[PDB]
Design a protein around this motif. Structure first.
Motif, PDB file in Angstrom:
ATOM      1  N   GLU C  29      51.419  67.459  76.363  1.00  0.00           N
ATOM      2  CA  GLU C  29      50.305  66.730  75.802  1.00  0.00           C
ATOM      3  C   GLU C  29      49.227  67.712  75.359  1.00  0.00           C
ATOM      4  O   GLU C  29      48.875  68.618  76.142  1.00  0.00           O
ATOM      5  N   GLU C  36      46.572  66.963  68.231  1.00  0.00           N
ATOM      6  CA  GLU C  36      46.405  65.943  69.225  1.00  0.00           C
ATOM      7  C   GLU C  36      47.677  65.087  69.250  1.00  0.00           C
ATOM      8  O   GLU C  36      47.826  64.129  68.508  1.00  0.00           O
ATOM      9  N   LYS C  62      47.595  53.021  64.391  1.00  0.00           N
ATOM     10  CA  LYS C  62      46.805  53.846  65.251  1.00  0.00           C
ATOM     11  C   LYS C  62      46.924  53.481  66.738  1.00  0.00           C
ATOM     12  O   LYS C  62      47.183  54.337  67.606  1.00  0.00           O
ATOM     13  N   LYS C  63      46.728  52.203  67.054  1.00  0.00           N
ATOM     14  CA  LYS C  63      46.842  51.746  68.456  1.00  0.00           C
ATOM     15  C   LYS C  63      48.250  51.944  68.961  1.00  0.00           C
ATOM     16  O   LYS C  63      48.456  52.228  70.159  1.00  0.00           O
ATOM     17  N   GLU C  66      48.863  55.524  70.113  1.00  0.00           N
ATOM     18  CA  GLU C  66      48.293  55.761  71.449  1.00  0.00           C
ATOM     19  C   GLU C  66      49.144  55.113  72.532  1.00  0.00           C
ATOM     20  O   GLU C  66      49.389  55.705  73.593  1.00  0.00           O
ATOM     21  N   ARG C  67      49.639  53.877  72.274  1.00  0.00           N
ATOM     22  CA  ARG C  67      50.500  53.229  73.220  1.00  0.00           C
ATOM     23  C   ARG C  67      51.761  54.046  73.483  1.00  0.00           C
ATOM     24  O   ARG C  67      52.223  54.147  74.618  1.00  0.00           O
ATOM     25  N   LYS C  69      52.349  57.218  73.327  1.00  0.00           N
ATOM     26  CA  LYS C  69      52.056  58.359  74.238  1.00  0.00           C
ATOM     27  C   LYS C  69      51.878  57.881  75.683  1.00  0.00           C
ATOM     28  O   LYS C  69      52.356  58.528  76.624  1.00  0.00           O
ATOM     29  N   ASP C  70      51.217  56.728  75.856  1.00  0.00           N
ATOM     30  CA  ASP C  70      51.136  56.148  77.204  1.00  0.00           C
ATOM     31  C   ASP C  70      52.527  55.849  77.765  1.00  0.00           C
ATOM     32  O   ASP C  70      52.834  56.108  78.938  1.00  0.00           O
TER      33      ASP C  70
ATOM     34  N   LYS D  63      39.699  60.761  71.664  1.00  0.00           N
ATOM     35  CA  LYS D  63      40.648  59.977  72.438  1.00  0.00           C
ATOM     36  C   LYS D  63      41.511  60.867  73.259  1.00  0.00           C
ATOM     37  O   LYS D  63      41.938  60.501  74.342  1.00  0.00           O
ATOM     38  N   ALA D  64      41.841  62.048  72.732  1.00  0.00           N
ATOM     39  CA  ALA D  64      42.757  62.935  73.443  1.00  0.00           C
ATOM     40  C   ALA D  64      42.123  63.543  74.688  1.00  0.00           C
ATOM     41  O   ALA D  64      42.813  63.735  75.663  1.00  0.00           O
ATOM     42  N   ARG D  67      42.518  60.780  77.203  1.00  0.00           N
ATOM     43  CA  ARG D  67      43.920  60.743  77.613  1.00  0.00           C
ATOM     44  C   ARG D  67      44.205  61.862  78.605  1.00  0.00           C
ATOM     45  O   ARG D  67      44.919  61.637  79.601  1.00  0.00           O
TER      46      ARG D  67
END
Ligand SMILES: CC(=O)N[C@@H]1[C@@H](O[C@@H]2O[C@@H](C)[C@@H](O)[C@@H](O)[C@@H]2O)[C@H](O[C@@H]2O[C@H](CO)[C@H](O)[C@H](O)[C@H]2O[C@@H]2O[C@@H](C)[C@@H](O)[C@@H](O)[C@@H]2O)[C@@H](CO)O[C@@H]1O
Ligand SMILES: CC(=O)N[C@@H]1[C@@H](O[C@@H]2O[C@@H](C)[C@@H](O)[C@@H](O)[C@@H]2O)[C@H](O[C@@H]2O[C@H](CO)[C@H](O)[C@H](O)[C@H]2O[C@@H]2O[C@@H](C)[C@@H](O)[C@@H](O)[C@@H]2O)[C@@H](CO)O[C@@H]1O
Ligand SMILES: CC(=O)N[C@@H]1[C@@H](O[C@@H]2O[C@@H](C)[C@@H](O)[C@@H](O)[C@@H]2O)[C@H](O[C@@H]2O[C@H](CO)[C@H](O)[C@H](O)[C@H]2O[C@@H]2O[C@@H](C)[C@@H](O)[C@@H](O)[C@@H]2O)[C@@H](CO)O[C@@H]1O
Ligand SMILES: CC(=O)N[C@@H]1[C@@H](O[C@@H]2O[C@@H](C)[C@@H](O)[C@@H](O)[C@@H]2O)[C@H](O[C@@H]2O[C@H](CO)[C@H](O)[C@H](O)[C@H]2O[C@@H]2O[C@@H](C)[C@@H](O)[C@@H](O)[C@@H]2O)[C@@H](CO)O[C@@H]1O
Ligand SMILES: CC(=O)N[C@@H]1[C@@H](O[C@@H]2O[C@@H](C)[C@@H](O)[C@@H](O)[C@@H]2O)[C@H](O[C@@H]2O[C@H](CO)[C@H](O)[C@H](O)[C@H]2O[C@@H]2O[C@@H](C)[C@@H](O)[C@@H](O)[C@@H]2O)[C@@H](CO)O[C@@H]1O
Ligand SMILES: OC[C@H]1O[C@@H](O)[C@H](O)[C@@H](O)[C@H]1O
Ligand SMILES: OC[C@H]1O[C@@H](O)[C@H](O)[C@@H](O)[C@H]1O
Ligand SMILES: OC[C@H]1O[C@@H](O)[C@H](O)[C@@H](O)[C@H]1O
Ligand SMILES: OC[C@H]1O[C@@H](O)[C@H](O)[C@@H](O)[C@H]1O
Ligand SMILES: OC[C@H]1O[C@@H](O)[C@H](O)[C@@H](O)[C@H]1O
Ligand SMILES: [Ca+2]
Ligand SMILES: [Ca+2]
Ligand SMILES: [Ca+2]
Ligand SMILES: [Ca+2]
Ligand SMILES: [Ca+2]
Ligand SMILES: [Ca+2]
Ligand SMILES: [Ca+2]
Ligand SMILES: [Ca+2]
Ligand SMILES: [Ca+2]
Ligand SMILES: [Ca+2]
Lengths: 103, 103, 103, 103, 103
Positions: C29, C36, C62-63, C66-67, C69-70, D63-64, D67
C-alpha cells in the motif's frame, strides 16, 4: 457531561434504559427507500431500531447514526455482550440512542 | 415502522423474501465503469446483486447501498449465516433490499 | 446485468480472467504522491495493482476503487481464498477490475 | 508503474526501505490539534509516523493517508507481519510512504 | 514532531498521561443530539470521554475524533491492552487526546 449511559439517557425526555446483558440475537439491515434502517433483536423478543435519518435528527447526529449501525453489526458478528441500551420509547420499535458493552 | 424483514419487504412492490439459513458461498465485487456492484451466491445457486447506484435510488439510499456491500463482505468473511433476504424480483439477478442474520 | 465475474469481465475490452484459487501472498500500500495505489501478489509471483485514480476512471468508479483496496487488505488479513481476478491486461502490473472470493 | 515497494520507493527523493519482518510493537494515535497523526514502533525501537496532513501533501494523498492509518491499526491488532516500510528519512520520526505485508 | 505519546502530551496545556496497561472494561457510545460521544472505562473505575465535536476543535480534528472512536471500539472488542492515554484534565470525564497500545 455524563460519565455513563444511564446518566446520559436521563438527560432526554421520552427515554429509558434497557438492561440486556446479552448478545444480539438477530441483525437486520435495509437499503429500501424510506426504510434505510437497522433492526436488532434479543432472545427475549426485545426489538430495537436505529431510526431512518429524518427531521428528528440534527446534523451533528448524522455521523453518529451511521456509527451506531456499524457498532451493532460488529457487536452481532463478535457475539459481544450488550450491557444496556438507552432508547426513545415514543417509537415502535424503541429507537436506540446509546449502547454500552461491558463483559 | 416494521419490526422485521418480512414486514419491511411487504411494504414494497416487486419484492419477495428468500429464506436461505446459510452462509454466503461466494462474494464478487467490481470497480469497472458502469458495473460498480457486488454479487453474492449461495451453495444452492441463488444469486443476488447489490445494484449499481442509479436514478432508481434516492439520495438517502446511497450511503445504505455502500453499507450493504460492507455488510455482505464481512458476512462472507465471518461465514455468518444469512437468515433471509428481501429482494426486488424485477431485476436479474434479484437485487438486495434488506438482509437478516440470525444463528 | 452479469451474474458472475467471468461474464462481467467479458463486457470490457483488454481484460482477462486469472483463476488463482489461492490466498494473497503479499499486500502493499502506498500513500506517495502520484502512486496512491495497492499492489498484491500470489505465491507464484502473479502481481496485480489497484490503479492510481485518474482520468481513465469515471466518477462512479472512485468509491469502488477505494472499496477494492479495502477488500484486498481484509482478504489478505483473513487469508481468504481468491477465486478469480478480472484484470486489464494492458497495464503492468495487470490492473484489477473485479475479484471473486469462494472456495 | 512499479511492481513492488522497493521499486516504488526508489522513485522518490529522501526515501529508504526498512526491512522489518516483524509485527508492530506499539500503535499510538492522536487527535490533538496539529498533531493528528499515528506513530508505530517495532521491538528494535524503530519508530515511524503517518504525518499530519499538510502542505507537503497533494490532494490525491489525503484519502491514502487515512487509509494508511487504518492499515496500521488493523495490522497491529491482527499481529500482522510487516515486511518492509518505504519511508522519508527527512522527517523525524521517519515518515511512512508505503508498507508491505507478507511472510 | 514527537516520537511517543508522552512527549506529544507534553506539547499541550491541561494534559496528563494515565498509564493503564489494561484492556478497556466498558465501551459506550451515543447518537443523542448534543451528546454524540463515546465513553470508556477501565476496571479501576477510570472513565474517559471522546468529546462531542465543538468550537474548541479545529477542522483537522474532526476526522481524528471519528477515528479515535473507531479505535476505542475495536480495541474493546479485541481486548487490546491500552498502554497510556493522554487526556485533557480540564474536562469531566477526562477527555482523550491520544492513545497508545502495546504489551
Ligand atoms: C413484538 C416484538 O417483536 N416484541 C415484543 C416486545 O416488544 C418489542 O420490544 C420492545 C422492547 C419495544 O421496542 C417494542 O416496541 C417492540 O415491539 C415486547 O416488549 C414490551 O414492549 C412494551 C412496548 O410494547 C413495553 O416496552 C414492555 O416493557 C416490553 O416488555 C418487556 O420486554 C420484553 C422483551 C419481555 O422481556 C417482557 O417480558 C417485558 O415485560 C414483548 C412483551 O412480552 O413482546 C415481544 O417480545
Ligand atoms: C445462476 C443461476 O442461474 N442460479 C439459479 C437461480 O437463479 C438465480 O438466483 C435467483 C435468486 C435470482 O436472483 C435469479 O435472477 C438468479 O439467476 C434460480 O432461482 C429461482 O429464480 C426464480 C426467478 O428468478 C425466483 O427468484 C426463485 O425464487 C428462485 O428459486 C429460489 O432459489 C432456488 C436457488 C431454490 O432454493 C428455490 O426453491 C427458490 O424458490 C434457481 C431455481 O431455478 O436455480 C439456480 O440456483
Ligand atoms: C513479479 C513477476 O515477475 N511475476 C511474474 C508474472 O508477472 C506479473 O504478474 C502478471 C499477472 C502481470 O501483472 C505481470 O506484469 C507481472 O510482472 C508472470 O506472469 C506473466 O507475465 C507476463 C508479462 O511479463 C505476461 O503477462 C504473462 O501473461 C503472465 O502469465 C500468466 O499469469 C501467470 C501468473 C500464470 O498464470 C501464467 O501461467 C500465465 O500464463 C509469471 C508467469 O511468467 O511469472 C511471475 O509470477
Ligand atoms: C525511539 C528511538 O530512539 N528508536 C531508535 C531508532 O530511531 C527511531 O527510528 C528510526 C527508524 C527513525 O524514524 C528515527 O527518527 C527514530 O527516532 C534508531 O534508528 C536510527 O535513527 C537515527 C536517528 O536517531 C537515524 O534516523 C537512523 O537512520 C536510524 O537507524 C536506522 O533504523 C534503525 C531501525 C536500524 O535499522 C538502523 O540500522 C538504521 O540505520 C535505532 C538505530 O540505532 O535505534 C532505535 O530503534
Ligand atoms: C467516579 C468514577 O467513575 N471513577 C473514579 C475516577 O474518576 C474518573 O476517571 C478519572 C480519570 C476522570 O476522568 C474523572 O473525571 C472520572 O470521574 C477517579 O479518578 C481520579 O479522578 C481525579 C479527578 O477526579 C483525577 O483525574 C485523578 O487522576 C484520578 O485518579 C487516577 O485514576 C484513578 C482511576 C486511580 O488509578 C488513581 O490512583 C489515579 O490517580 C478515581 C479516584 O481514584 O476513582 C474512580 O475510579
Ligand atoms: O434525535 C432523535 C429523537 O428525536 C426526538 O425528538 C424524538 O422524540 C425521539 O423519538 C427520537 O427520534
Ligand atoms: O430503490 C431501488 C428499487 O427501485 C425500484 O424503483 C425498482 O423497481 C427496484 O428494482 C429497485 O431498483
Ligand atoms: O476504468 C479504467 C480502465 O479504463 C480503460 O479505458 C483502460 O484501458 C483500462 O486499463 C483501465 O484503466
Ligand atoms: O508527500 C509527502 C512527502 O513530500 C515530500 O516533498 C517531503 O520531502 C516528504 O518529507 C514527505 O512529506
Ligand atoms: O482540542 C480539544 C481541546 O481544546 C482545548 O482548548 C480544551 O482546553 C481541551 O479541553 C480540549 O477540548
Ligand atoms: Ca457462539
Ligand atoms: Ca470478551
Ligand atoms: Ca468454515
Ligand atoms: Ca472459510
Ligand atoms: Ca455465532
Ligand atoms: Ca496461515
Ligand atoms: Ca498468517
Ligand atoms: Ca501474540
Ligand atoms: Ca496480542
Ligand atoms: Ca477474554
Amino acid at each position: 457531561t455524563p460519565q455513563n449511559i444511564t446518566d446520559l439517557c436521563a438527560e432526554y425526555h421520552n427515554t429509558q434504559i434497557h438492561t440486556l446483558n446479552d448478545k444480539i440475537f438477530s441483525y437486520t439491515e435495509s437499503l429500501a427507500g424510506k426504510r434505510e434502517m437497522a433492526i436488532i433483536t434479543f432472545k427475549n423478543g426485545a426489538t430495537f431500531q436505529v431510526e431512518v435519518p429524518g427531521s428528528q435528527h440534527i446534523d451533528s447526529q448524522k455521523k453518529a447514526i451511521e456509527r451506531m449501525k456499524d457498532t451493532l453489526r460488529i457487536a452481532y458478528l463478535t457475539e459481544a455482550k450488550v450491557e444496556k441500551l438507552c432508547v426513545w420509547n415514543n417509537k415502535t420499535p424503541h429507537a436506540i440512542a446509546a449502547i454500552s458493552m461491558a463483559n
